[PDB]
Amino acid sequence: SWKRNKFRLTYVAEAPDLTQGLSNVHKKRVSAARLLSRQNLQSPKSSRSTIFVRLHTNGNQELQYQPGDHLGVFPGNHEDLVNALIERLEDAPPANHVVKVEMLEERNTALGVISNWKDESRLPPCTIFQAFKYYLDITTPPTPLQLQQFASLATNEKEKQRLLVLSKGLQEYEEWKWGKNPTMVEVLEEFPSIQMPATLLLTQLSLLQPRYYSISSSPDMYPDEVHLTVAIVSYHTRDGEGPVHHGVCSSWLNRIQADDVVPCFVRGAPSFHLPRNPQVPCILVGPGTGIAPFRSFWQQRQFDIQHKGMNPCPMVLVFGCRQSKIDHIYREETLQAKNKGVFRELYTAYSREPDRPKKYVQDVLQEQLAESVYRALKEQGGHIYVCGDVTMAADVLKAIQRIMTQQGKLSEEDAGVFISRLRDDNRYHEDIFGV
Ligand SMILES: Cc1cc2nc3c(=O)[nH]c(=O)nc-3n(C[C@H](O)[C@H](O)[C@H](O)COP(=O)(O)OP(=O)(O)OC[C@H]3O[C@@H](n4cnc5c(N)ncnc54)[C@H](O)[C@@H]3O)c2cc1C
Ligand SMILES: NC(=O)c1ccc[n+]([C@@H]2O[C@H](COP(=O)([O-])OP(=O)(O)OC[C@H]3O[C@@H](n4cnc5c(N)ncnc54)[C@H](OP(=O)(O)O)[C@@H]3O)[C@@H](O)[C@H]2O)c1
């Protein structure tokens, strides 16, 4: 918690570089990758965007990965936002000097009570600008409790009262939060009478979390590179008259220039790797950006075939998107992979195709691949991988359970048990893109 005269900023001469600071803060080895290129994957006439990102690992062995793994990425908040926030600070040193945070530690029933300054040691030594851009979350709306604290900092009665109403965290708060999705700087601007101490924000804001992305490349096909498939998150606030808010990491990845440092790390996904046995059938289900890990899969299989002399069992891809002319990302690539024997068949379920009835990936599974799915999973030691949206994944599970009841001639209960065992045996895989 925070209180006046509890924290102070102190100038210091030494400071680690970004990747070291992040490593120290998050207690894990963060590495420095480089942006090689970025390309838009959807049609320019699309209302949305998905970008293809190519990163170079600088030959750093700590960034070794296998198809199916994830890459945690640390983005930077937008500078205009960082600058605007610093401008609303009450006692902020120029934001270009390296400082550390010290906290007045007081002790107990020690009869007189003894205070002692010492390093808080949350953030590493850095400038205020660097702290707000690379280490802290300045975008997540403040909690009712934070607004309560903000109320005691407002010098305008009317504003204090409003803040106090919101601090109740009920109807008024929900309306405010859900309608405005206010960033920290936005709150200070709505209530300009708030006297915001730099130390409060520097110690109370949460740490900026890394964002995970399913690696979209095979390490053999692209040595020293890591590819990502990123949906661009952008949204209108206040029903339309409010400003447009952009996802922090996706917008950052959409802004960086070639050579810019991208702090990241690999997080292995032991339960989302291709099978050790190349001869069993695999069915890949990944609509939209959910196709991401499967790009690493088809590149690896293509490489294994053409360079390792392997003859793996051809896989099946079940993709889905809105329209053939808008968001059918990686279309030509999957086509070429099929031509080289990686895939036996490709399927695409279009949901908003002009003059075409809506189709979801689960529809393809049930209407065109029911017997195939059943034979692969039950009789051929096969695997099924599902990647993407959480609701889609849940719906696909249901479709597979239905296939098991019909094709397998099982009761609801036993179909569920079978699927549960598939998960346990690591033959049913899920890569869900959670919030
Ligand atoms: C294991 C794992 C793998 C993943 N792989 C991928 C991948 O390969 N490709 C990919 O694109 N994503 C992937 N995701 C998502 C990714 O990690 C990020 O969560 C996503 O890119 C958004 O990050 P951001 O920083 O851009 O957004 P943030 O700034 O964190 O904001 C995201 C938040 O924006 C808010 N938001 C979005 N639209 C609206 C709206 N209309 N109204 C109000 N609020 C809104 C929500 O609160 C939302 O959760 C994965 C997630 C996990 C857990
Ligand atoms: N599509 C989603 O699953 C979903 C849900 C909430 C937010 N988002 C956001 O949209 C961006 C793109 O995500 P995305 O690439 O994963 O998805 P997406 O591009 O929005 O959608 C891909 C395909 O999945 C279909 N779909 C939607 N709900 C489904 C379900 N329950 N079962 C099967 N298919 C379903 C979509 O159809 P229709 O949309 O036409 O119905 C579309 O054809 C992200 O930024 C993400 O956070 C996506």
415: annotated binding-site residue? no
- Ligand 2 centroid to residue 325 C-alpha, Å: 17
Whose alpha carbon is nearest atom 12 of ligand 2?
Answer: 231
Name residues whose C-beta falls within 8 Å of residue 108's C-beta, 6 or more positions apart in sequence.
none
Give the Å distances, CA to CA, from 398 to 89, 141, 285, 318, 349: 52, 35, 14, 16, 17
Answer left, alpha or beta for residue 330, where phi above 0 means left and psi between -120 and 50 means alpha: left
Cα gap 90→98, rounded to integer Å: 18
- CB atoms near residue 189 (< 10 Å): 15
Please choose, from the candidates 361, 353, 408, the residue with its C-alpha nearest in 3D space to the C-alpha of residue 384. 361
Helices and strands in the chain, H and E counts: 15, 16
Task: Check if 361 has its Cβ closer than 6 Å to any atom of ligand 2.
Answer: yes
Instruction: Please indicate if the annotation marks 395 as binding a ligand.
Output: yes
Compute, in angstroms, the gap from residue 120 CA to the centroid of ligand 1. 31
> Has 211 been labeled as part of a binding site?
yes
Q: Residue 376 in 3-state DSSP?
A: helix
Other CB atoms within 10 Å distance of the CB of residue 378: 16
Copy the structure tokens of residue 35: 């942006």
Q: β-strands 428-432, 383-388: how paired?
A: parallel
Cα 217 from Cα 225, distance rounded (Å): 8
Burial 129-138 (b: 16+ CB within 10 A, else e): bbbbbbbbeb
- Treating both helix axes as pointing N-terminal to C-terminal, what angle do 390-407 and 361-368 enclose, rounded to 10 degrees? 10
Q: How far is the CA of 41 from the centre of ligand 1 (A)?
A: 18
CA-to-CA distance for 216 and 52, rounded, in angstroms? 9
Expressed in angstroms and rounded, the spacing between residue 351 Cα and the centre of ligand 2 is 10
CA Rg value for the chain: 26
* Residues in contact with 367: Cβ distance below 8 Å, sequence separation at least 6, in sequence order: none
| Ligand 2 centroid – CA 26 distance (Å) | 31
Helix or strand (DSSP H, E) at 248: helix 248-253
Q: How far is CA 407 from CA 155, 235, 398, in A?
A: 70, 43, 14
DSSP string, 283-318: EEE--GGGGHHHHHHHHHHHHHHHHH---PPPEEEE
Residue 369 backbone class (left: φ over 0; alpha: ψ -120 to 50; beta: rest): alpha
Pairing of strands 244-246, 261-267: unpaired
Q: Phi-psi region for residue 376, left (φ > 0), alpha (ψ -120 to 50) or beta?
A: alpha
Q: With beta carbons less than 8 A apart as the criterion, state whether 283 and 40 touch.
A: no
Instruction: Identify the DSSP state of 233.
Output: P
Give, in degrees to the nearest 5, the angle at Cα 223 between 217 and 229: 25
Q: 429 to each of 161, 271, 290, how far by Cα in Å?
A: 52, 7, 13
273 neighbors 374 (Cβ within 8 angstroms): no
Task: Decide: 358 and 352 in contact? Cβ < 8 Å.
Answer: yes
Residue in the structure block whose two tokens are 């996706």: 250
Does ligand 2 lie within 6 Å of residue 287's CB atom?
yes
**Local structure of 38: helix, strand or coil:** strand
CA distances from 383 to 157, 250, 311, 315, 404 (A): 63, 31, 17, 10, 14
Helix (H/G/I), strand (E/B), else coil: 368:
helix
Cα atoms in the 13 Å half-sphere on the side-chain side of 394: 5
Whether residue 302 contacts residue 264, with contact meaning beta carbons closer than 8 Å, is answered with no
- State in Å: Cα 232 to ligand 1 middle: 9
What Å distances lie between residue 106 and 112, 114, 149, 205, CA to CA?
A: 10, 5, 22, 23
Sign of the CA dihedral running 254, 123, 434, 223: positive
Residue 137 is labelled as binding a ligand: no
Ligand 1 pocket by Cβ (under 6 Å)? 70, 139, 181, 211-214, 229-231, 233, 235, 247-250, 289, 292, 433-435
Q: Provide the token pair at 378.
A: 């039950």
* Ligand 2 pocket residue status of 5, Cβ below 6 Å: no
Q: Which atom of ligand 1 is nearest to the CA of 267?
A: 1
For ligand 1, mutation pick of 238, 330, 433 (most atoms within 8 Å of CB) = 433
To one decimal, the resolution in angstroms is 1.9
- Asked if 228 contacts 55 with a C-beta cutoff of 8 angstroms, the reply is yes
Cα dihedral across residues 237, 243, 249, 253: positive or negative: positive
Question: Which ligand is nearest to the Cα of residue 226, counting in written order?
Answer: 1
Binding site annotation covers 160?
no
Best residue among 181, 206, 208, 211 to mutate for probing ligand 1's pocket (most ligand atoms within 8 Å of CB) is 211
In angstroms, the CA 70 to CA 212 distance is: 6
What are the tokens at 274? 């291709």
Q: Ligand 2 within 6 A of 289 CB?
A: yes
For the chain, which domains are there? 1-25+76-209 (1.20.990.10), 26-75+210-272 (2.40.30.10), 273-435 (3.40.50.80)
User: Pairing mode, if any, of strands 383-388 and 261-267?
Assistant: unpaired
Q: How far is CA 241 from the centre of its chain?
A: 27
